[PDB]
Amino acid sequence: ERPILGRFSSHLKIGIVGLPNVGKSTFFNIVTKLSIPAENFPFCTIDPNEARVYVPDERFDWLCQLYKPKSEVSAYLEINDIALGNAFLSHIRAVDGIFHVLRAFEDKDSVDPVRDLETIGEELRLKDIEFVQNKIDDLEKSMKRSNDKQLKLEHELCEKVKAHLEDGKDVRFGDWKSADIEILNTFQLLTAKPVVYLVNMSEKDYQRKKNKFLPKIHAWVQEHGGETIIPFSCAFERLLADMPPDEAAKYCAENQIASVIPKIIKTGFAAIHLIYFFTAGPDEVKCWQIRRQTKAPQAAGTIHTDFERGFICAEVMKFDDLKELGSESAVKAAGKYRQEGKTYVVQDGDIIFFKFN
Ligand SMILES: Nc1ncnc2c1ncn2[C@@H]1O[C@H](COP(=O)(O)OP(=O)(O)NP(=O)(O)O)[C@@H](O)[C@H]1O
Ligand SMILES: [Cl-]
Ligand SMILES: [Cl-]
Ligand SMILES: [Cl-]
Ligand SMILES: [Mg+2]
């Protein structure tokens, strides 16, 4: 319903945030080892702390089996290893979502995730108050010399925002009007950025699917957003990425265990409000990355500007209808090759051909 809280930008990043020595770089290096080579994004500089990972998708893979196309193109998630400090917030402001890593395994100076959640939670809210407060000063200083309604509106929000933060809540979970969000998105505020909780634990805990700290983390999250908790073992994953495909498959069978990195990649990608639509022929099958609540013309623009400027229609078929009926010819036969106009919001998984001029 409401507009999305986050920057109206193409190149979205997710940051690895957490207390020191909980698994941040060990998780990043697993991610890095699975990354796309930086030379394949020639328009971008990929710093050593940055990596981009293919978003795995079973629907995408099925479309590659069907068309057996010449070019298979995936979407990607950009993950940023950050660092806790002050210059910590430079790297943290430049991302659009947080992999909040939390330590849930015993050492071999204390072990507690919910305490670490509070430390970072509080530390995040405080530096947002610091941000809001300064613009609160700058606004009312300028309102002395101007009668601008926008200065008043921005001032009213900044007061309501600081109330929310002092009340012990994150800007992300406020009940904001559409126009408040517009102003909020200018501020790039830390607690406006979405979180995916990654509970790092032993390989034993992970495989057993039980952990002493998990119910205490889980119940806390329900009281603070209800965001996704993915339990994972950083050691197991490190171990598993270091071994080749069939050794991994033998290991996964014999230990009755499986990697959750794909789920982590998928969940992070969705959590920062990205989706994609497919295009699919023998030429290529490609995932077309877009923000949620994107209308069909703006989606078409992402391929070629003309597709938007002279937009006629988007010829869209759902994935479920293609896998069921076996081919596009067959989907057409059943009158399921729909035709959508300029106010059609694109669904994740839509397979689209655009008509224009
Ligand atoms: N599930 C686990 N079991 C055992 N050891 C682990 C597990 N997860 C992480 N570790 C170890 O704990 C350490 C965590 O450090 P690391 O992953 O480098 O975080 P970091 O990047 O140092 N965070 P920061 O200090 O903010 O830079 C590593 O040396 C890991 O080997
Ligand atoms: Cl850094
Ligand atoms: Cl440092
Ligand atoms: Cl097209
Ligand atoms: Mg690190």
UniProtKB/Swiss-Prot annotation:
Positions that bind ATP: 21-26, 43-47, 81-83, 200-201, 233-235
Activity control, per UniProt: Activated by GAP1.
E.C. no: 3.6.5.-
Xref: InterPro entries: ATPase_YchF/OLA1 (IPR004396), Beta-grasp_dom_sf (IPR012675), G_OBG (IPR031167), GTP-bd (IPR006073), P-loop_NTPase (IPR027417), TGS (IPR004095), TGS-like (IPR012676), TGS-like_dom_sf (IPR023192)
GO cellular component: cytoplasm; cytosol; plasma membrane
Residues binding Mg(2+), per UniProt: 25, 45
Compartment(s) of residence: Cell membrane; Cytoplasm; Cytoplasm, Cytosol
Domain TGS as annotated: residue spans: 273-356
Gene Ontology BP, a term: response to salt stress
Cofactor: Mg(2+)
OBG-type G domain sequence ranges: 12-252
Keywords: ATP-binding, Cell membrane, Cytoplasm, GTP-binding, Hydrolase, Magnesium, Membrane, Metal-binding, Nucleotide-binding
Record-level Gene Ontology MF annotations: ATP binding; ATP hydrolysis activity; GTP binding; GTPase activity; metal ion binding; ribosomal large subunit binding
Annotated binding of GTP, by residue: 21-26, 105, 200, 233-235
Main location per the UniProt record: membrane
Domain free text: The C-terminal domain is involved in RNA binding.
UniProt xrefs under NCBIfam families: redox-regulated ATPase YchF (TIGR00092)
Subunit structure: Monomer (Potential). Interacts with GAP1.
Family classification: Belongs to the TRAFAC class OBG-HflX-like GTPase superfamily. OBG GTPase family. YchF/OLA1 subfamily.
Function: Hydrolyzes ATP, and can also hydrolyze GTP with lower efficiency. Has lower affinity for GTP (Potential). Exhibits GTPase activity. Exhibits similar binding affinities and hydrolytic activities toward both GTP and ATP. Binds to the 26 S ribosomal RNA in vitro, but not to the 5.8 S or 18 S rRNA. Confers sensitivity to salinity stress by suppressing the anti-oxidation enzymatic activities and increasing lipid peroxidation thus leading to the accumulation of reactive oxygen species (ROS).
Name of the featured protein: Obg-like ATPase 1
Organism: Oryza sativa subsp. japonica
Organism classification: Eukaryota, Viridiplantae, Streptophyta, Embryophyta, Tracheophyta
